[PDB]
Design an enzyme around this catalytic site. Structure first.
Site, PDB file in Angstrom:
ATOM      1  N   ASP A   1      -3.072 -18.340   1.278  1.00  0.00           N
ATOM      2  CA  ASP A   1      -4.172 -19.088   0.693  1.00  0.00           C
ATOM      3  C   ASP A   1      -4.594 -20.232   1.553  1.00  0.00           C
ATOM      4  OD1 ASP A   1      -1.887 -21.058  -0.488  1.00  0.00           O
ATOM      5  OD2 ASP A   1      -1.649 -19.114  -1.328  1.00  0.00           O
TER       6      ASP A   1
ATOM      7  N   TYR B   1       0.828  -1.183   0.000  1.00  0.00           N
ATOM      8  CA  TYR B   1       0.000   0.000   0.000  1.00  0.00           C
ATOM      9  C   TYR B   1       0.855   1.222   0.000  1.00  0.00           C
ATOM     10  CZ  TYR B   1      -4.110  -2.709   1.281  1.00  0.00           C
ATOM     11  OH  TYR B   1      -5.231  -3.502   1.249  1.00  0.00           O
TER      12      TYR B   1
ATOM     13  N   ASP C   1     -10.854  -8.907   7.365  1.00  0.00           N
ATOM     14  CA  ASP C   1     -12.200  -8.845   6.838  1.00  0.00           C
ATOM     15  C   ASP C   1     -12.757 -10.232   6.713  1.00  0.00           C
ATOM     16  OD1 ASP C   1     -12.465  -6.084   6.544  1.00  0.00           O
ATOM     17  OD2 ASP C   1     -12.347  -6.161   4.402  1.00  0.00           O
TER      18      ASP C   1
ATOM     19  N   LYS D   1       3.536 -15.842   1.835  1.00  0.00           N
ATOM     20  CA  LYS D   1       3.488 -16.562   0.567  1.00  0.00           C
ATOM     21  C   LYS D   1       4.950 -16.919   0.339  1.00  0.00           C
ATOM     22  CE  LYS D   1       1.321 -18.497  -2.521  1.00  0.00           C
ATOM     23  NZ  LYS D   1       1.292 -19.798  -1.841  1.00  0.00           N
TER      24      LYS D   1
ATOM     25  N   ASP E   1      -5.312  -7.274   6.076  1.00  0.00           N
ATOM     26  CA  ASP E   1      -6.492  -6.573   5.721  1.00  0.00           C
ATOM     27  C   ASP E   1      -7.453  -7.521   5.059  1.00  0.00           C
ATOM     28  OD1 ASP E   1      -8.145  -4.485   4.657  1.00  0.00           O
ATOM     29  OD2 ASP E   1      -6.499  -3.536   3.694  1.00  0.00           O
TER      30      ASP E   1
END
Lengths: 345, 345
Positions: free
Chosen positions: A217, A139, A245, A185, A241
């Site tokens: 994942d 970000y 959620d 990852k 994030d």
């Protein structure tokens, strides 16, 4: 116990007071030395002082030991520019207090199983805390860009930015069930490799806390299939994030969840939920996340782990005995704060 | 209808044949002109020809109209080097046939609701297809690196790489309920902005298909809360990879799911599931994903949308009437292929 209280806009006045009533009861009862002051913040401060986070408030949160923050936001302010709209203030108290880790716990409170999307047997016993890194990664990382032809974005992390959020997570784990899971990852990306070796290093120092690693994942499937197998989860920003959620749907009957930004400065603790103007002033607001942000202040800002668990148990029992209107019950803010208090004695 | 059939290792021989028995029944019945040939691929080809994807097979899949692929993998081969282990072959048939989009559908078959993690009312009517971009983004983008101090990784996409997977998705949608949802992080990242304007451009050309956009963190909550509100979903690589793994838990009783790589060359269609050596030769393997990969060949490689829906209905009815051992039933591969065939007439 020095608390700058920032009630904000909309239901923040009502629900922050339900939280202060718990913290005064316990203070009376345990002798904690609560000293608190209420400061302007949010659309109410844009209205009064012409900016969302005015320098009395800058000072207030810079000198206190904890901030209790309610909620800001209200349509009235969207119209005008950028640094004069309630949400700018939320990044400035984050910048000023150098907060870099966001803690979001999810608990599915036994009594409210049936409101969850997962069958009861998947949510039984869910209690975990995802500490998300806050200031880094894609970000904010760079280079970044957009052409007619292509667009790019870097996901970057330095050893410091990873050790900071990992130590929050291990310390964070000492207080509850002692197991960290880091999320990455690392089988495809090198930022993920790097995260994984750094968190394993920083792990050496906290020997009473177990450490496991998992891919993003695979952790996404485990939060629906077995969410109860986690206590503290630590991950980077975009993955934290997405993953917080996804985790927020497990309780189902929403709006019950708390949040805490942590860092070098003063810890900030808010409910995860907006201003909710629609119902400001009516008595019906559900205080459960506010009361639970207070309990997170006690646990992270004052080390009072034993008492924070007593406030989470009183609000469990209370959600069982008087659900608020928003859960098919009829208890307003005050009758609900009441039954919480009534179990703290 | 020219099909190179690559049964692979472990249960691939058994389950690929259950699929060919459906495709011969329909061929007899509809006159489709099936012409198929079986080629070596996988640990069996490493054993026979000394490499996992040998040039008869290279030619085979390069000259056919569809590949039916079963599964490769078996421990026997992990020991030896890299380009001589069953899985290397899977990237070489992907490279050779220039495949760039992976389609993964999830259907929760009415009869098997109770095996799902979500309460029945969340899974009712789930039928969606996530088409994931396959060759780009952060896994392959560059620059990338790792120092003592820091690690980095770029997420990059060019207008071509985005239009290719978007046209797959719209065309892919014409055949089922006509609605695309694209998935990005366009409120924070510019790669996400760029993806969003390109997919909206490419959308102009497909006017009978509706287009909606959604953020990755919001789509992660919607796959547990309302998954039935989607038909085709199109997203980049790491987000497609996280999001398809989260979507795979919705059926619950796993191993039922199909997969199809699509691109410039010959489409490849496999079940999502491994070799499963443990049970190779015993008759018990569940053919449902193999039979459903055949139905995806019919729909994407031969345009036979109406027939692919008849094979998905026969396998629905069949899962209802004879669940295989792996779903609390006792039907082997053959007795299950049977009841499928028995509804195709």
């Amino acid at each position: 116990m020095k608390v700058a209280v920032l009630p904000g806009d909309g239901i923040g006045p009502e629900v922050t007071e339900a939280a202060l009533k718990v913290l005064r009861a316990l203070d009376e009862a345990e002798g904690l030395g609560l000293a608190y002051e209420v400061f302007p913040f949010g659309g109410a401060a844009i209205d009064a002082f012409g900016e969302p986070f005015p320098e009395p408030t800058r000072k207030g949160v810079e000198e206190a030991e904890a901030v209790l923050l309610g909620s800001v936001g209200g349509p009235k302010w969207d119209q005008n520019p950028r640094e004069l709209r309630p949400e700018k203030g939320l990044l400035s108290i984050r910048k000023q207090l150098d907060l870099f880790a966001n803690l979001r716990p999810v608990k599915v409170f036994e009594s409210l199983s049936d409101a969850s999307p997962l069958k009861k047997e998947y949510i039984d016993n869910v209690d975990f805390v995802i500490v998300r890194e806050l200031t880094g990664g894609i970000y904010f990382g760079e280079p970044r860009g957009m052409s007619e032809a292509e667009a790019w974005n870097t996901e970057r992390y330095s050893k410091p930015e990873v050790e900071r959020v990992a130590r929050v997570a291990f310390e964070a784990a000492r207080k509850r069930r002692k197991h960290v899971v880091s999320v990455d990852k690392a089988n495809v990306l090198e930022v993920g490799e790097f995260w994984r070796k750094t968190v394993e290093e920083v792990g050496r120092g906290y020997p009473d806390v177990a450490l496991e690693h998992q891919y993003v994942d695979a952790m996404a499937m485990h939060l629906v299939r077995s969410p109860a197998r986690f206590d503290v989860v630590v991950t980077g920003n975009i993955f934290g994030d997405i993953l917080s959620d996804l985790a927020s749907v497990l309780p189902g009957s929403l709006g019950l969840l708390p949040s805490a930004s942590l860092g070098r400065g003063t810890p900030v603790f808010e409910p995860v939920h907006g201003s909710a103007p629609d119902i400001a002033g009516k008595g019906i607001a559900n205080p459960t996340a506010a009361i639970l942000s207070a309990a997170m202040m006690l646990e992270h800002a004052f080390g009072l782990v034993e008492l924070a668990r007593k406030v989470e148990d009183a609000v469990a029992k209370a959600l069982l005995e008087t659900p608020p209107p928003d859960l098919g019950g009829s208890a307003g803010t005050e009758a609900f704060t009441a039954t919480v208090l009534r179990h703290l004695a």
